[PDB]
Amino acid sequence: SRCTHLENRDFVTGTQGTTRVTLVLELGGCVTITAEGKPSMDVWLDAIYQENPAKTREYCLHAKLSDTKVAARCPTMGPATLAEEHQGGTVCKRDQSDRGWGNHCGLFGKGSIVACVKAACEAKKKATGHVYDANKIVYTVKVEPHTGDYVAANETHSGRKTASFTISSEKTILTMGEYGDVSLLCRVASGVDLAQTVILELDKTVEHLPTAWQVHRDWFNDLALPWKHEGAQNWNNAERLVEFGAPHAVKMDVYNLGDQTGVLLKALAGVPVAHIEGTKYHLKSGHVTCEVGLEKLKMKGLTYTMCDKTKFTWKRAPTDSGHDTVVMEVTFSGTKPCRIPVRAVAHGSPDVNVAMLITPNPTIENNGGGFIEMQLPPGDNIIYVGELSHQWFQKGSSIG
Amino acid sequence: SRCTHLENRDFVTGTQGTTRVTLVLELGGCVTITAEGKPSMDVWLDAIYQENPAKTREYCLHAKLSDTKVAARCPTMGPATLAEEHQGGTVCKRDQSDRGWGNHCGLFGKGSIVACVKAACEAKKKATGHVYDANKIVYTVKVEPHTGDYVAANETHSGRKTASFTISSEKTILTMGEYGDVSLLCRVASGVDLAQTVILELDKTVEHLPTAWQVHRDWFNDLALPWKHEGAQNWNNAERLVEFGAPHAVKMDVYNLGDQTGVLLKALAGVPVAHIEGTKYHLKSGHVTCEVGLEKLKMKGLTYTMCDKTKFTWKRAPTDSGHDTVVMEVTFSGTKPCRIPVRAVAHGSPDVNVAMLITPNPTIENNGGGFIEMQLPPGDNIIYVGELSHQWFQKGSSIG
Amino acid sequence: ATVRKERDGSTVIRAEGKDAATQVRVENGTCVILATDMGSWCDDSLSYECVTIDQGEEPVDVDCFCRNVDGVYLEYGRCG
Amino acid sequence: ATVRKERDGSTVIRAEGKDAATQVRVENGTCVILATDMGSWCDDSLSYECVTIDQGEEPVDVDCFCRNVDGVYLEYGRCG
C-alpha cells in the first residue's frame, strides 16, 4: 500500500464503541485508521490547490536597453533636457560634466548633462506570480481500504475514493464499495494567509530549473527588480537594472546590470519548490483537520469459508514496515474466496495470540488478496498463516 | 590646452637658478611647469600598461548541464555507483532514498542513490583575467609646450612629445623642437603588487557592459564560480552552479543555479572600470615620480619684433581657468611673427605689472599663437594686450 | 518510444512528451511511462531505472515501472 | 557614414566601425569621428552631440567634433 511506504505515517486505532475520530492530515503523510469489527482505511491529504489564481505583478530578470540619448548644456547655460525624463518607458540620470573651450563652451566649469535609455525586458526573462484566495482553494482528501489489493491488469487502484472540499462545502460521505460508508468533515487550516502566499514561476529558457516556489507575498513584493502588472505598457523601477557611466564633456555611457536569474535563485535556495499541474497551482505545505465517521463501515467477507491451513506459501516473508509493524504477503494454492487463519505467538505461550492485526480480516480474493500487517510485542515471536510459520524477532521500543 | 581643462591640474613654478624639479604624475591629471627665462611645459602621465599580459584562470558564469544519470540500490544492497564520480567533467551527489516493495525492494528502508551530471560552460559566458608583471609594464609620459598652438589643418597636436619608460629604461631626453631639450628620470610607484593586480573582462553578449575592471588577485581567486586554466579539459568546482533535488525512489533531478552575470556585476559596482586598446591592458589608477630637467630649455621667438599695440582683438576675453588663473585668446590683425605686449595692473597702480604669466613670452605665429594665461592678485585688475584692455575681478583665496 | 538492447545485457527506453501516460512492450514484459516533464530528445536529459514491479504490486514513488521484464532504463530529453 | 538633415533644423551622422578615425563633410563643415566602440546599426545605440570646435582650437574630452558646421549629432549601433 502507498501508505506503508511513507516516513510520515500515523496510526489511529479506535475502540469497540468509537464511531468518530479527529485527525490532522498533512500533505505528504498518511494515516491508517483501524477500528474493531470494521476494516482498516488509509486516509490522506492529497492536495491543496487553486485553479486559475489571480496573477500578481511580474518582474524583469534581464533588462533590454536601447536608444540611449545624451544631452548637455554649457556652464551658466541652464539645464539639459530630453522628453524621455517625464516618460515611463525610460531610465534617466542628471549629472554634471567638466566643460571648456575645447568642447564648445566659452566658460570652464561644470555643465548640465542628462542621459536617457529605453528600458524593456528580454524575451523569456520574467518571473511571474499568482496569489491564493481561501474562497477559491480546493482540498482533496483520499480514502482507500488498507488491504493491499491492486488491479495490475488495468493498473487501477481498487477501492480508492476522492473527496473534494472547499471552505463552504466541507462535509462528505464516501461509499467504499462493499465496505460501506465513511463520512468526512474537513476544515482547512493554512496557518499562512493564503492571500499572503505567492507561487513564483520563471519563464522557461534552455537551463533546467524547478517548476515554481512557494514564497510569502511580503518578500515577493520586496524583490529589487523592475515590475509591472500584465498588460502595462512599461516597467516600473526600471532604474534597478541600469548603471550610468562617468560623464565626459557631452557623452555618458549607459550599461546593463546583467541577468538576475542567479541572484534570484541564490535567494530561492531553501525555499519549498511547488508544483503546477496545468491550471492547478499547488500549496507545497499545509494540513487539514477531519472528523472521520466509521459507524457505516462494514466488514467484507464475513460469511466466507476459512482458507485451508496447508495451502499457504510466502510471497513476501515477514519484514519490518519501518513503523514498528510487520508486513507480509502470502500465496494461497487452494480454492478462492476465503478468510486467512493468521495468528502469532510469543515463545513459551503457544495458546496466546499476540498479533494485533492492522488488516483485521485478511481474505484471499479470486482477484487479489494475501497482504497481512500486524503489531507484535518485543522479543521472539512465531507468525502463523495457517500451518505456514515464520519466526520473527521484534525490536524493543521505537527507533523513530 | 588639454591640461587647462583638467580638475586635477597642478602647478610647479621654478626659480631663476632651478634646473631640476621633482614631480608626482598621477593618471588623469597634469602638471604645468613654469621656469623663469624658459617656456612653460605641460607634463602628464598618459598610461601605465602591459601588452599581452599572462592570462589568469577563467571562470564560468553560466553552466551548461547535460547527460544526467541516476543510479540506485535497495536497502542492505550496498552502494550505487556511476563511473562519473571519479571523473573531472562531472558533478555528483550521493544521497539516500525511501525504498520498499512498490519500487522493487524486498525491504522497507533507505537505499543508496547517486545522481551525476556533465558540467561545461555556455558559449560566451566566461569571465577571463590577465595579471600584470612589473618586469613587463610600460609607462608613457607626455610633454607639450603650454602655448595653446594646434594645427587644426591636419588635426595634429604641435610640439607634443612622448617618452616611454620601463623598470630598466627609466631615463629619457625629449627634444621640444625649437624650445630645446627636457630630461625625464621617472620611477613607477604602483603601491599595489602588480603581480597581485588582475584585469577582469567578460565575454561579449548582446547587453552593453563596461570593458573590464581592475580587481585585486586575492578577491578574483575567491570568486565562488567553477574555474579552469585556458586549455584544460574540464571545469574545477563545477558543483558551485548545480543544485540536486529531493531523491525519489530511483530518480533525483539535477537543476542549474542560473546565470551569475548579475551576481558578479553587483560585486563589481564601485570597482574601477579599466580600458583595453588592442594588445594594451591599462592600469586605471597609478602614478609615477619624475625628476624634470629644464636646463636645456630655450625661449622661442626672443629676437622677434614686438606686435603693434593697436592690432589686437579679443578672440576669447579673460575667463576663469578653474585653477585660480585667467585664460584668454587674442586675434592680431598686423604682420606676423611677433611678441605680444601683455600686462595687467591693479586699480590705483598704473605703473606696476601684477601679471604673473603662465605662458611667459606670448608670440603671434604665422600659423597659431594668441593664447595667454596669467595669475592675478585678488581684486579689481585691468588686463592689457597692447592697447586692448579688459577689466577683471579676481576672487579671493581659492575655492578648491 | 524507441527500445534498444545495449550489448551490456541492459535495455534502454528513449521516450518523449507523446509517450507520457502510455504502455510500451519490452521483450516479454511491458513498461509504463508516467513522466510528466518530457520533451524532444537533446543534451538536457535525465536517465534512471524503470523498476520491475513484482506481479500484483502497486508501484510507489516511481514514474516508470516494468512488469515481466528486468533491467530497463529510461532516458528522455527536455527540449521544445 | 550617412548624413541626414532632420526637419527640426538639426543634423544627424549615423556611423559604423568602418567610420572610426575618419573625416565626414557635413554642409559646409566637416566632422571627425573618433569613437572606438562602434558597430553595425541596431537598438543597442548611443546618440550625443558632435561639438562645433571654434577655428584653431584643440578638442578636449570629445570623441566627435565639427568645424564650420553647427548642431551636428552622432548616432551609432554596437552590434556585430
Numbering used by the authors:
A (entry chain A), B (entry chain A): 1 to 400
C (entry chain D), D (entry chain D): 1 to 80
Tell me what the authors wrote about this structure, in their words.
The flavivirus envelope glycoproteins prM and E drive the assembly of icosahedral, spiky immature particles that bud across the membrane of the endoplasmic reticulum. The immature flavivirus particles that bud into the ER lumen display prM/E protomers in which the pr moiety binds at the domain II tip to cap the fusion loop, avoiding its insertion into the ER membrane. Maturation into infectious virions in the trans-Golgi network involves an acid-pH-driven rearrangement into smooth particles made of (prM/E)2 dimers exposing a furin site for prM cleavage into “pr” and “M”. The flavivirus particle’s life cycle includes three key steps: 1- budding into the neutral pH environment of the ER lumen; 2- transport across the trans-Golgi network (TGN), where the pH is mildly acidic and where the particles undergo a maturation step before exiting to the neutral pH extracellular environment;19,20 and 3- entry via receptor-mediated endocytosis into a target cell, where the mildly acidic endosomal pH triggers E-driven fusion of the viral envelope with the endosomal membrane. The fusogenic conformational change of E is irreversible, and the consecutive steps outlined above require a special particle maturation mechanism in order to avoid premature fusion-triggering in the acidic TGN during exocytosis.
Here we describe the X-ray structure of the soluble E (sE) dimer of TBEV in complex with pr at acidic pH, revealing a crucial role for the 150-loop of E domain I in relaying the fusion-loop capping role of pr upon secretion. Crystals grew at pH 4.6, which diffracted to 2.6 Å resolution. The X-ray structure, determined by molecular replacement, showed two pr molecules bound symmetrically at the sE dimer interface, each contacting the tip of domain II of one sE subunit and segments of domains I, II and III of the opposite sE subunit in the dimer. The contacts of pr with the domain II tip are therefore intra-protomer, while those with domains I, II and III of the other sE subunit, which had not been observed previously, are inter-protomer. The buried surface area (BSA) per pr binding site on the sE dimer is 1265 Å2, 62% of which corresponding to intra-protomer and the remainder to inter-protomer contacts. On pr, the surface buried by the sE dimer is 1328 Å2, of which about 80% correspond to the “capping loop” (CL) (labeled in Figs. 2a, 3a), so-named because it caps the E fusion loop, as described in more detail below. At acidic pH, the pr capping loop fits snugly into the positively charged cavity formed upon lid opening, with intra-protomer contacts with the E ij hairpin and fusion loop on one side and inter-protomer interactions with E domains I and III on the other. pr thus wedges in at the sE dimer interface, in line with its role in stabilization of the sE dimer at acidic pH.
